[PDB]
Symmetry: C2
Subunit: 256 residues, 2 copies
């Protein structure tokens, strides 16, 4: 059960995973900040302050009120300074030929700025297909949503197994999973887990939370995706650091 | 087996489904055009040329390079003029909380112009709880993706089954399904089947096609979603008419 640094250096390691792993190990952070905010200013301000604490800033540009390509440029600037990956959490879930367009074009041009995107496995491997056609090219990686944090989530049993197969049979482009838990023994593969807060509980629309220590330490995940847990806090930085220090020790404690 | 005119008049019918069913009848058309083009101009030109022939125009506003809300306004103008519904094939598939913003907000403000949207049930009912919070207000309907035309789709059995329960426990918002077949016995529920072409075939990236006769007559669906079968045709107007007539006649033969 290697460290992050050792994993970055694994043989079958999408350059995005390694890039990611090299900075988790380097920055002592397995914290992905879910920058769910509607205002480019906020997005960017959290990205800056929180960047050195994070390994990944996750975005929903389709949630961004003042979205412009210029905003991703800036987002990339900070991603590069503070060294975190940009993950656009577009949860692609259409047929190959559509996601292709959805990833590459329209106004979002996700592919031109998102190191990682994720995709739902429902549509079948074609979803990965359509995206790789855009992503592989532009040197991008994808997370497959193998489990979901939310109640009723039908990413279970053989859905999850299928997300795993899909990722394995596409390791060229899939760099990991969105899952609540570790789900591939293949340590080449990242586990990012949403539904993480320091306290217990959920939210009104179906979200379910677990502690970093539970997720990383016990459930064997790599990286915690944390939104309101931090964003809603007053001092998002303090929060981030609390989230950082938490996922990091859970991780260290697992490895020991 | 009720006619569209009849079905529009149903007790548990969503206002939107009848606006739709009412015009399917009036106009002798169960065809939904999948306007998978990327230029507003072509979207609008198609809507206009082809709205006499369609009950609905399905969009991916996020494929649209020159998307503005003004274009959607022009689309609505043509939706009112020619009388079709606008269905944005957004396939929401996130936790309740995220989808809300994705549907209401960001630069698309889908709900301000989308009579219809659809979502995947994989997150669990949160996605529909999240969507309806924006949607019931605006008088919008939602389809739940219970099956997919795509190869290796993971919407099968208890997944497809879930999608139905979810629909039925949200009939307030869910006007129906994206499915390959009729999936609900509840006639209030629209079935809109994509992966439709006159000729047998598919694509590279996992699309599979069935004929209007197959989808509507045999599999029990109401509306066909037809993109490339029409759009790539040279005389799109004659194409739509073929698909119109095929889908209309298949329905007529099933009603018979």
């Amino acid at each position: 059960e290697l460290s992050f640094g050792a994993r970055a250096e694994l043989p079958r390691i999408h350059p995005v995973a390694s890039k990611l792993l090299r900075l988790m190990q380097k920055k002592e952070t397995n914290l992905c900040l879910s920058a769910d905010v509607s205002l480019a200013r906020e997005l960017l301000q959290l990205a800056d302050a929180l960047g050195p604490s994070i390994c990944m800033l996750k975005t929903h540009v389709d949630i961004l009120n003042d979205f412009t390509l210029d905003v991703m440029k800036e987002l990339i600037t900070l991603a590069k300074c503070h060294e975190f990956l940009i993950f656009e959490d577009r949860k692609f879930a259409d047929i190959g030929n559509t996601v292709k367009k959805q990833y590459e074009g329209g106004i979002f041009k996700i592919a031109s700025w998102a190191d990682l995107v994720n995709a739902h496995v429902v549509p079948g491997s074609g979803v990965v297909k359509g995206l790789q056609e855009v992503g592989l090219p532009l040197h991008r990686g994808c997370l497959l949503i193998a489990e979901m944090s939310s109640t009723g989530s039908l990413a279970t049993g053989d859905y999850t197994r299928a997300a795993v197969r899909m990722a394995e049979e596409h390791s060229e482009f899939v760099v990991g999973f969105i899952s609540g838990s570790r789900v591939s023994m293949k340590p080449e593969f990242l586990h990012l887990t949403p539904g993480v807060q320091l306290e217990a509980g959920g939210d009104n629309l179906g979200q379910q939370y677990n502690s970093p220590q539970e997720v990383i330490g016990k459930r064997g995940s790599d990286i915690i995706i944390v939104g309101r847990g931090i964003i809603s806090a007053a001092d998002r930085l303090e929060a981030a650091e609390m989230y950082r220090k938490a996922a990091w020790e859970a991780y260290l404690s697992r490895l020991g």
